[PDB]
Amino acid sequence: EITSSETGTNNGYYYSFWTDGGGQVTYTNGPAGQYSVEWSNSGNFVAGKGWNPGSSQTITYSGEWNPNGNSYLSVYGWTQNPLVEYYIVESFSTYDPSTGAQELGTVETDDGTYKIYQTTRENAPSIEGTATFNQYWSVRTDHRVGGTVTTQNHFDAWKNAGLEMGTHNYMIVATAGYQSSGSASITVQ
Ligand SMILES: [Zn+2]
Ligand SMILES: [Zn+2]
Numbered sequence: 001e002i003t004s005s006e007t008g009t010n011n012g013y014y015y016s017f018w019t020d021g022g023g024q025v026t027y028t029n030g031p032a033g034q035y036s037v038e039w040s041n042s043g044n045f046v047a048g049k050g051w052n053p054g055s056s057q058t059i060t061y062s063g064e065w066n067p068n069g070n071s072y073l074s075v076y077g078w079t080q081n082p083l084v085e086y087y088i089v090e091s092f093s094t095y096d097p098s099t100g101a102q103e104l105g106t107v108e109t110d111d112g113t114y115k116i117y118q119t120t121r122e123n124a125p126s127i128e129g130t131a132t133f134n135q136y137w138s139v140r141t142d143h144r145v146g147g148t149v150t151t152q153n154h155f156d157a158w159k160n161a162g163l164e165m166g167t168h169n170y171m172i173v174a175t176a177g178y179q180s181s182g183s184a185s186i187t188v189q
Helices: 151-160
Strands: 006-010 013-019 024-029 034-040 044-051 058-068 071-080 084-092 103-109 112-124 131-140 147-150 167-178 181-188
Touching (some): 013 024, 024 044, 034 044, 044 071, 044 181, 058 071, 058 151, 058 167, 071 181, 084 112, 084 147, 084 151, 103 151, 112 151, 131 151, 147 151, 167 181
Antiparallel strands (some): 024 034, 034 181, 044 167, 058 147, 058 181, 071 084, 071 167, 112 131
16 A cells, blocks of 8 residues: 555554665555555564554554564654653564663563663654654563553553653554564554
8 A cells, every 4th residue: 555654544543654765665554453564675664553642551452463584563652852762562573672772670561571671862763853862662571462561551660760751642553674574464452
């Protein structure tokens, strides 16, 4: 359906499709909370459906995620003032996003354990344009596709660990890839 970056609202869900234009990345909206993405020798992309703005709602999602190479399935979003990109990583394939970060703790929620990390990005694409911003990570120890994410438990754990959150911008269930191929079909319930 679309092959270049776009945001909108479809069947009552915010959607964000971002690609740096590398290889081929194809996104489609489905009924209700559903989206599909297919990608071949991609650059960096992030795609999904959810809310704008995010509250700190309990997310339920279903579907399938079939990467061949580097990909993450995550609750993904932004805060503003301060500018923060955050990830609650449910699965990653061939590359752990927290590589080269101090573990700041763990949080137990939704029948799993998540390792907490903070990174910085310098002169990087953001919802505000080229910027410097912190990235917060919750990375599940037992990878899964589907289930419940109690986002407030992650936000509270990050704040407990001294990681400041801003005003919530969007929050989506995202499929991310980098220099990989794959497909995914995800429904936000
Ligand atoms: Zn995995
Ligand atoms: Zn398992």
